Amino acid sequence: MKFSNITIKNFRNFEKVNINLDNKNVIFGMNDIGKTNFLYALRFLLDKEIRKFGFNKSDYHKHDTSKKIEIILTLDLSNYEKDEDTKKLISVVKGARTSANADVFYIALESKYDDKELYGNIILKWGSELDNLIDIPGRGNINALDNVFKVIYINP
Amino acid sequence: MIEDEMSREQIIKDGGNILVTAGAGSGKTTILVSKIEADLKENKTHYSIAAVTFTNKAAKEIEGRLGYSSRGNFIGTNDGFVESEIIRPFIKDAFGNDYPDNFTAEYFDNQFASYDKGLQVLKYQNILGTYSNPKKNFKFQLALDILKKSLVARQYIFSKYFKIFIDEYQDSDKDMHNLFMYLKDQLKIKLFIVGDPKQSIYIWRGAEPENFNGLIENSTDFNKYHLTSNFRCCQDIQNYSNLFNEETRSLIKEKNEVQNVISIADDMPISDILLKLTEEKQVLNIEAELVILVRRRNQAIEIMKELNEEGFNFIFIPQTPLDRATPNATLLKEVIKYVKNDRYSIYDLAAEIVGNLSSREIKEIQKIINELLVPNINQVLINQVLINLFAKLEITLDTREITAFTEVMMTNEFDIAFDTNEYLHKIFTVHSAKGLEFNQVIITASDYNVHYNRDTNEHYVATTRAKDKLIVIMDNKKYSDYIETLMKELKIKNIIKSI
């Protein structure tokens, strides 16, 4: 498994930012706001403790302009042909990938506008292709993604 | 203010059933959006609305103009309305507990011709089918029977939905007219109805134009309205657009000065004056959409090659063989958009198959058009079209159309280019400018029409295709002697602006 790239289509400081990814990522720069918003975007995608609070008014590009937030992550689901990690990596989800020879897995985030009821309504969808993404099935409060990724956040 | 303004103001503050007899397209959905925006803002209760269109693409266009809401509005096709509000929640109540609640509804395989045999498809093999006849609807009649039988379906559809907004009622069979009249008779739900009576009905085979036209002759509980859609913005162009020769001249009222019509040219220096309204008078805006309508397509290239030397980089789009009026023009144009754009999404073409609500059957038609990806001009074009034709019915609407369909992709490129992207500086001839409206226009008075002094439709589309501004320029003597006749007989001398 290997992270490939992340696309933040809208956030509180990002407009059309596309970042390539890998394992063991190191992010630096002068803009501390951009780094902490990148980490908050990662937490919003992969942690339920921040997902359960929803989006506010201040977490947009402008506070009323372009109320449409998408955060997409690529996964590189396939492995080597001599390694049997491919089926064990695939077998967490069943109906998301139509083809057994699919290569790249997508995990996406969707946001609703903030004029009515003042709330964000975080929606998560995954799939092996950009179009016709399916919703992540959650039977209770815990969805299917939280059984896969356990996020540990360290900050002294 | 004549037929444009009073039709809008009498349709916003109304509160009863509405039957609008709109024109032949060109913005009937503007008033559908503007009424919904007025109705949703006026009503402050928990009741929501429902907007019904035929194609799924027009449902996204209505949703795009509206925005988004959390009121529980239903925007979509009529097939999605019946399958999700009446059948799927209430199938297990009205027709027995043993009937299943989840199913896939394919309209590509089943061709049964019995109602009682129809329930055997749903009960046994979990498939919701369709009738044999085009003049039938198994889905809409099942929604009528469930609503008539069970009680809690009736407790739903009155208490959530305020008014159902209906569009293209003219090509509607008997079954959908029975359900939509049932919601008005007993359950007391208001309706909004738009469409054009008769005048070459197409779409959703099985039409029955006594459902719509019979609701204008003898019906009484319907506020009937005339041609109401405002194709042209403002008033000053409309007075020019209502001239022709006579008849509508009594509907024209004129003022002391004009605003949107400028006539300054005599010796046409095309590059010089057309620059001068941009900077020296601030009339023309380059960033806005500039459309220029001329005839004789070789002369448009001569204009194009002149401005390519200057730098305007003008674009011409010609008359395709498919631009002739045919019932299959809407989806045949979209098919070549799938293959010639080389990246175009299949679900945009999937958003045009009449009633839509197609899941997993898009991949069946994806493989058929993927066989058309090979060039293979001679002998693959006939069969793979007929294979694509036979899947979605509407069969033998061909011969003349398929010969023109071979002509547009003859040698794979009839002129290499097609309307696949978005660009400005477009030229349209009269053969292919019908239907879509234009923001800016510099057509310089639409010459070469004094020879006939007849054929009033030809200068009608030259005048009415603009939105708010339009430029008429004194160029020709015979045009001037023709328009000097229209000075005196209009009873008002003002056509020109001067201090």
How is this structure best summarized?
It is classed as immune system. This is part of a larger assembly, with chains A (156 residues) and B (499 residues). Chain A is an alpha+beta fold and 156 residues long.
Any key phrases for this structure?
part of a larger assembly; 2 chains; A: 156 residues; alpha+beta; B: 499 residues; 6-stranded parallel β-sheet; 4-stranded parallel β-sheet; 19 helices; 12 strands; 40% helix; Gabija protein GajB (chain B); P-loop_NTPase (chain B); ATP-binding (chain B); UvrD-like_ATP-bd (chain B); DNA_helicase_UvrD/REP (chain B)
Q: For the report, how would you describe the main beta sheet of chain A?
A: 6 strands, antiparallel
Radius of gyration of chain A: 16 Å
Helical content band of chain B: 40-55%
Total number of beta strands of chain B: 12
Terminus-to-terminus distance of chain B: 26 Å
Helix content class of chain A: 10-25%
The fraction of residues assigned to DSSP E strands of chain A is 15-25%
Strand content of chain B: 5-15%
Rg of chain B, nearest Å: 26 Å
Shape of chain A: globular
Q: Strand order, biggest sheet of chain A?
A: 2-1-3-4-5-6
Can you describe this structure?
This is part of a larger assembly, with chains A (156 residues) and B (499 residues). Chain A is α+β, with helices and mostly antiparallel strands. Chain A is built from three helices and six strands. In chain A, a hairpin with an 8-residue loop joins β1 and β2. With 499 residues, chain B is α/β, with parallel strands linked by helices. Helices cover 40% and strands 9% of the residues of chain B. In chain B, α4 (78-94) packs across α6 and α6 runs parallel beside α8 (174-185). A six-stranded parallel β-sheet of chain B has the order 3-2-6-7-1-8, with helices on both faces. At the A-B interface, loops of A face loops of B. Chain A: ATP binds at residues 32-36.
